[model samples]
Target chain A: TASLVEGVELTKYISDINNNTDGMYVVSSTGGVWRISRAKDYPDNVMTAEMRKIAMAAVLSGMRVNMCASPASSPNVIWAIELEAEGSGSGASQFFKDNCNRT
Target chain B: TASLVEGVELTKYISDINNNTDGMYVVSSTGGVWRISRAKDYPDNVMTAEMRKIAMAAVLSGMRVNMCASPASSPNVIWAIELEAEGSGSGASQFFKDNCNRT
Candidate 1:
């Protein structure tokens, strides 16, 4: 039962993943490594059960989530997750492998 | 009553059917499909009359207009058009079927 750690929103995180040509890298406060894609659009506050499952799964997979304000000029913008459990490759390579299924 | 066949031009065959995605397969020279798309920004022309009644109703729908000149990296470049009785399906789908009589 991984709960929301602190900070990150869930939407922007997903949008970034979708538009991202490179995968995201996360380094937890505990020094763990994690990788995640914030693709997939989601609805309002109410996270679908499936989404919750995915979130929790990521946490358990050893990633720490955190929210950070966007530097852009917009409020209510708090959806940036930082996964912490999988380091090494360039975001682009990870992106192609994970999303494009390229070899 | 479509008539003007000679070497296609009318704005790059209507700007390559608005940036085709795949649709453009005519095998008629009398044998050759002509898929095209090269942007759009035309000016200066003579044939203007509902574009000459849609070029005499597509040359009375016989498909044998003959303009010419368009080969990679070069001059004037005559737009290009070769409808030839609407064939295959690739560049998306014909904006809409026969203006009516859906399928």
Candidate 2:
């Protein structure tokens, strides 16, 4: 349930995007899964190409990652991160469940 | 606002995209303003480029058009239309307030 993405060596590279029931799905070295997506109806609460860069970066690295989305929604936002070193297993089962993103 | 695109003559061409906070802003010939984007948090609700083509078609056609979005969210759908001839101002300030495109 935890997503990590930050730093040049972060371990949790984004497993995959596109064609998923969840906005963005991430896997941890510890084998945890989480669905990240937009929780609000606000205009800016979605995954843009810019956001995809960050999502991909998180996927490429094991940095602490969070995102939001809706469908035919465009983006799955990366809200905040603790940028961990690659392969850090300190992922969480939850994120900052606030106005923009939900668990 | 009525976005129009269909056949070869529909007149509501998409004005522009990007650098705007209102998802994808569309203008109608009647000068109506509408913000279209993802209305739901469903994984498939966001706009992809394919959806954009449909939206632009609506904008170009002046045909009955509607969309949904969330900004960092992606798409605004072109739900349904009665396929009016060009320059037809049968536009409604209201559309099908259904499970997707919200007013």
Candidate 3:
């Protein structure tokens, strides 16, 4: 938790995915998205390329990073990062795959 | 002023440069430098490539953008942007030439 990026903190969310039935929570912040696994076998994940690029775009466009989370996990963990226009209360979502894969 | 970058504001300084004898002050901010022309013809001068690059480097080095100002304007304007070691008063300075030239 101390390793967390500034302006960001960790939070847990419930997941409907099979392996992640317990659900996976993530760290959300003004900087970007961060992921955590409850399985204890996997390492904590931070922002991905897609998330970083999208966040950069949002900042450049005068928007801010809003709610973000990943979906189900297949060969890899699935997560989503969302962005919304400031004061608009609406946003768009994008999904990403975690780099770690276990056979 | 409204178009100024956040965490940055404008400030004026005295210059010894010719034509600009009144001293061309600039807009200083956490973002970068902004130059203003006292002479009616010249509009305002903003950050240059050299200034921007140095600022970017300071950020990357975990340092912050400190005092920045240009020297005399020969064919153009002369400015200096400075950086300090985090927590240390000792720092380095780099000078730049303004692009504006009048024959």
lDDT scores in order: 0.28, 0.35, 0.29
- Give the per-residue lDDT digits (tens) of candidate 3, residues B2-78: 12121222121111111212122232222122342222221322343344344334322334443323333322232
Residue A52 alpha-carbon offset, candidate 1, angstroms:
44
TM-score of each: 0.20, 0.26, 0.22
Residue-by-residue lDDT tens digits, candidate 2, A1-103: 2233322221222211123322433334343333333433455454343343453445433355533322233232344433333345644334433433433
Clash number for model 1?
37
> In the order shown, what is each candidate's alpha-carbon RMSD?
20.3, 15.8, 18.7
Sort by TM-score, best first: what order? 2, 3, 1
Best by lDDT: 2
Candidate 3 chain A has its poorest 10 consecutive residues by lDDT at A94-103
lDDT over C-alpha atoms for residue A99 of model 1: 18
What's the CA error at residue A76 for candidate 2, in Å?
A: 15
Tens-place lDDT per residue, model 3, A8-103, is 222323234676443433333332334422322111111232233333444444433332233333222323233332332222211101111101
